[PDB]
Structure 1
Amino acid sequence: HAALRQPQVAELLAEARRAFREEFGAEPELAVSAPGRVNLIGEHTDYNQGLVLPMALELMTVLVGSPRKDGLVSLLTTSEGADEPQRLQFPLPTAQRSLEPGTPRWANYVKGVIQYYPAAPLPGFSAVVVSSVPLGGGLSSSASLEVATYTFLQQLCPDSGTIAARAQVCQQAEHSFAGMPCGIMDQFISLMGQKGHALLIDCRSLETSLVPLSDPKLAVLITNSNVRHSLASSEYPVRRRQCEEVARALGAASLREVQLEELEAARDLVSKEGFRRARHVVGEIRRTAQAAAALRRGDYRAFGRLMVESHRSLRDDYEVSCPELDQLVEAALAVPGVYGSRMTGGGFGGCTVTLLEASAAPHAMRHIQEHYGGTATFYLSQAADGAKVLCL
């Protein structure tokens, strides 16, 4: 019932630096950091060209390294949650032959970003990877590694592209090398986050707004279920297809073009579950605009309430909650000074996010732990920076 230590850039850097020296026998030339994410509201909207309101966490992936002249990639990772081996080497992909996904799984993230990095000539490199983002804990560890990877290749061989194009590369890596067809959000927030700000992302226009998210009377409590049902992986692409079918059945480019009136009128042209999936998306996009508005004018109570409506939508219409998250939500909402709680991320496990009076975070943690049928993990994050570079 205490908030886990969040090591700062400087300490994770020192750790990666010590590790790099031991493994390669020379100080690294470069250092990058990219954070994980919590989504405040706007779940399953991103691949629906909707609105998302994520913020970057203090939890991050650091990567320290050095260019090589031999064209090969040598990786070590210190994240002992990672799958064996901790070390991998492979040559740069060529016109002739490409990197392929395999073992160990953690390296597929680096391989994917390197495969789709759009700027030549990319040299080989030696790199240590360290992370505070809990691996597959539903705060976008993978996106943090993809974006850190991207940030590092930029030092090797500058791109000339947009922030969104870089996110799209990281997302391609997730799709093709991790086999998780994610939307743009996790990569976008990891690139674009700013200390003290949530990032409203229009996943249609790709417009973004840094929204002041700084009142030291309020806190954001992340609770890890420490659970991940197999459906988190298998049912994610099912939701995407269901959403896509409902949009085909309505002549819509996306569910962003569809309001509840239109959707109710066409009840006959879609499945019982189709209609339910779409009802959530439509309502979640509305609720994200509403939450954005509420945040600007300082209406924490309206914001918390919209969080509770997003969770109910996710649990009943989208059906991507699970008993553990349901339990952590009802627990959190029973604590004086809690304005709202919801599952965040893909669903079927992972974390909940809770907005509450800062002075209440301690009591919230005691009560959620006591009421949780398993063992919950706690972080208290303010909004944090996106991808950063330190020359060494």
Structure 2
Amino acid sequence: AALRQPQVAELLAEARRAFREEFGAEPELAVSAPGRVNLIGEHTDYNQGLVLPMALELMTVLVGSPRKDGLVSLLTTSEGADEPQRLQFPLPTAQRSLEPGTPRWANYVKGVIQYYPAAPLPGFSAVVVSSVPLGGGLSSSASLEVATYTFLQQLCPDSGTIAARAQVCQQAEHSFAGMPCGIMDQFISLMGQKGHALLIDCRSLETSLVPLSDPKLAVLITNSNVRHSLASSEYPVRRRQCEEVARALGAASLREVQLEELEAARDLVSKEGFRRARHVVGEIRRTAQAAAALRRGDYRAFGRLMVESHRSLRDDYEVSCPELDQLVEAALAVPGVYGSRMTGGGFGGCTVTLLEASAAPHAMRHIQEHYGGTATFYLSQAADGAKVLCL
């Protein structure tokens, strides 16, 4: 029993209603920006690797209007968001930059404003709503940043590429949330096309659309409904460790390293650094091969590469957890399932499973059965990326 994914109209209607009540008039401007699931290619983006995500129908919607007084006035209805759920602050100026603070949700919006590259930006009033489960590993924060960015463009048009916009949002994440993420989540939020996954080269920033127009193929997202303590915590540790192995081999990044050279330099790096790098180098290759497999509709090869991804994440990268692992095994048991793995950052969040559409009802029954906690499910079609909604 998959979760009804609210369509853009229901989200818009919630956004506008709350805006009216809060501000005393209709909003002038509106935007949407989706979350994402990564099909394969985990912990490779900040290593200048390859990733293969798709945009989801789960999305963040933001409505608003310019002001004349230089202030930003925000309201979110999102029920998980930390309080307060309203916030105001001045626009950054030459005299005074904004800073990270509480509530944490607002730091994503503050950051994007701070680094927005075009001027002059007026103040604004806005309400944000989201169907993206909050920090459950489908990029809620990126959807919020890219929604913000896309709204600011309506107030004050920018002049660069789409990669530059993704980089602005990434910068907000680094400086205002203390989270040194790669570019994947932002970039897919911006670049998603419905009926397509995106092979993103995080070194070149070349992207290619890979079809998913098979009605016999389903992508099932299972949320573990767990978020252990370590996104805050362990993600920046894995990044630094990767960067250190690259530095030690005289490589600009691990993208430049392959498994033979790594093995020959075992003595130059920690045992644990070796294992992390081994994951990354292998994951880059798996992603390139998975993309090719996906293209020729060889789902079986694709699902195999997914499973190898999961084992490498669990064992070498150590960013799985008992729950994700159990969900993965539960799903692998089901006839018609090609593959399953954790997706996103790890320590919680969701698995992604590729399967025959007709197995999806049994898949969901059996996973729920064989999981201790309580899963939720999304039956997920690949979706468009960010856009303006004309009011």
TM-score bracket, normalised by the shorter chain, equals over 0.9
Deviations along 1:133-189, one digit per CA (max 9) or x if unpaired, are 000010000000000000000000000011011001100111111111100000000
In the alignment, the residues of structure 1 paired with residue 193 and residue 39 of structure 2 have an alpha-carbon distance, to the nearest angstrom, of 15
In the alignment, the residues of structure 2 paired with residue 271 and residue 367 of structure 1 have an alpha-carbon distance, to the nearest angstrom, of 41
Deviations along 1:233-261, one digit per CA (max 9) or x if unpaired, are 21101101110111011110011111111
Deviations along 1:221-279, one digit per CA (max 9) or x if unpaired, are 00111111112321101101110111011110011111111111111111111111011
Maintained 8 Å contact 1:136/1:142: yes
Shift of 1:353: 0.2
In the alignment, the residues of structure 1 paired with residue 83 and residue 246 of structure 2 have an alpha-carbon distance, to the nearest angstrom, of 42
Tell me which residue corresponds to 2:111: 112
In the alignment, the residues of structure 2 paired with residue 26 and residue 231 of structure 1 have an alpha-carbon distance, to the nearest angstrom, of 42
Maintained 8 Å contact 1:332/1:341: yes
3-state DSSP of counterpart to 1:281:
helix
Shift of 1:22: 1.3
Deviations along 1:184-232, one digit per CA (max 9) or x if unpaired, are 0000000100100101000000100111111010100001111111123
In the alignment, the residues of structure 1 paired with residue 370 and residue 82 of structure 2 have an alpha-carbon distance, to the nearest angstrom, of 32
3-state DSSP of counterpart to 1:60:
strand
- Please, which runs of 5 or more residues in structure 1 have no aligned partner? none
Tell me which residue corresponds to 2:242: 243
3-state DSSP of counterpart to 1:391:
coil
Tell me which residue corresponds to 1:220: 219
Deviations along 1:41-67, one digit per CA (max 9) or x if unpaired, are 000000000000000010000001001
Deviations along 1:70-128, one digit per CA (max 9) or x if unpaired, are 11111110101111111111111100011111121111111000010010000000101
Name which of structure 1's ranges 94-103 and 146-155 shifts more when overlaid on structure 2. Answer: 94-103
Tell me which residue corresponds to 2:359: 360
Maintained 8 Å contact 1:171/1:183: yes
Maintained 8 Å contact 1:328/1:368: yes
Instruction: Report how many aligned residue pairs link the two structures.
Output: 391
3-state DSSP of counterpart to 2:349:
strand
Tell me which residue corresponds to 2:251: 252
Shift of 1:19: 1.2
In the alignment, the residues of structure 2 paired with residue 308 and residue 369 of structure 1 have an alpha-carbon distance, to the nearest angstrom, of 20
Tell me which residue corresponds to 2:160: 161
3-state DSSP of counterpart to 2:166:
helix
In the alignment, the residues of structure 2 paired with residue 146 and residue 232 of structure 1 have an alpha-carbon distance, to the nearest angstrom, of 18
Q: How does the TM-score come out when normalised to structure 2?
A: 0.99
- Please, which runs of 5 or more residues in structure 2 have no aligned partner? none
3-state DSSP of counterpart to 2:352:
strand
In the alignment, the residues of structure 1 paired with residue 367 and residue 250 of structure 2 have an alpha-carbon distance, to the nearest angstrom, of 45
In the alignment, the residues of structure 2 paired with residue 126 and residue 244 of structure 1 have an alpha-carbon distance, to the nearest angstrom, of 41
In the alignment, the residues of structure 2 paired with residue 124 and residue 307 of structure 1 have an alpha-carbon distance, to the nearest angstrom, of 45
Shift of 1:15: 1.2
In the alignment, the residues of structure 2 paired with residue 161 and residue 273 of structure 1 have an alpha-carbon distance, to the nearest angstrom, of 40
In the alignment, the residues of structure 2 paired with residue 33 and residue 22 of structure 1 have an alpha-carbon distance, to the nearest angstrom, of 21
In the alignment, the residues of structure 2 paired with residue 67 and residue 384 of structure 1 have an alpha-carbon distance, to the nearest angstrom, of 29
In the alignment, the residues of structure 2 paired with residue 35 and residue 163 of structure 1 have an alpha-carbon distance, to the nearest angstrom, of 15
3-state DSSP of counterpart to 1:186:
helix
In the alignment, the residues of structure 1 paired with residue 374 and residue 385 of structure 2 have an alpha-carbon distance, to the nearest angstrom, of 30
In the alignment, the residues of structure 2 paired with residue 124 and residue 245 of structure 1 have an alpha-carbon distance, to the nearest angstrom, of 42
Matched, 1:92 2:94: no
Name which of structure 1's ranges 317-326 and 229-238 shifts more when overlaid on structure 2. Answer: 229-238
In the alignment, the residues of structure 1 paired with residue 103 and residue 258 of structure 2 have an alpha-carbon distance, to the nearest angstrom, of 44
In the alignment, the residues of structure 1 paired with residue 224 and residue 335 of structure 2 have an alpha-carbon distance, to the nearest angstrom, of 21
In the alignment, the residues of structure 1 paired with residue 151 and residue 19 of structure 2 have an alpha-carbon distance, to the nearest angstrom, of 15
Q: How does the TM-score come out when normalised to structure 1?
A: 0.99
Maintained 8 Å contact 1:232/1:349: no
In the alignment, the residues of structure 2 paired with residue 233 and residue 91 of structure 1 have an alpha-carbon distance, to the nearest angstrom, of 27
Shift of 1:391: 2.1
In the alignment, the residues of structure 2 paired with residue 233 and residue 286 of structure 1 have an alpha-carbon distance, to the nearest angstrom, of 28
Shift of 1:26: 1.0
- C-alpha RMSD of matched pairs (Å): 0.7
Name which of structure 1's ranges 222-231 and 60-69 shifts more when overlaid on structure 2. Answer: 222-231
Shift of 1:38: 0.3
Maintained 8 Å contact 1:46/1:185: yes
3-state DSSP of counterpart to 1:233:
coil
**Superposed, which structure 2 residues align to 1:1-392 within 5 Å?**
2-392=1-391
3-state DSSP of counterpart to 2:232:
helix
Deviations along 1:271-327, one digit per CA (max 9) or x if unpaired, are 111111011000000000000000111101000110000000100111110000000
3-state DSSP of counterpart to 2:273:
helix
Shift of 1:17: 1.0
Runs (4 or more) in structure 1 with deviation over 6 Å come to none
Name which of structure 1's ranges 99-108 and 317-326 shifts more when overlaid on structure 2. Answer: 99-108
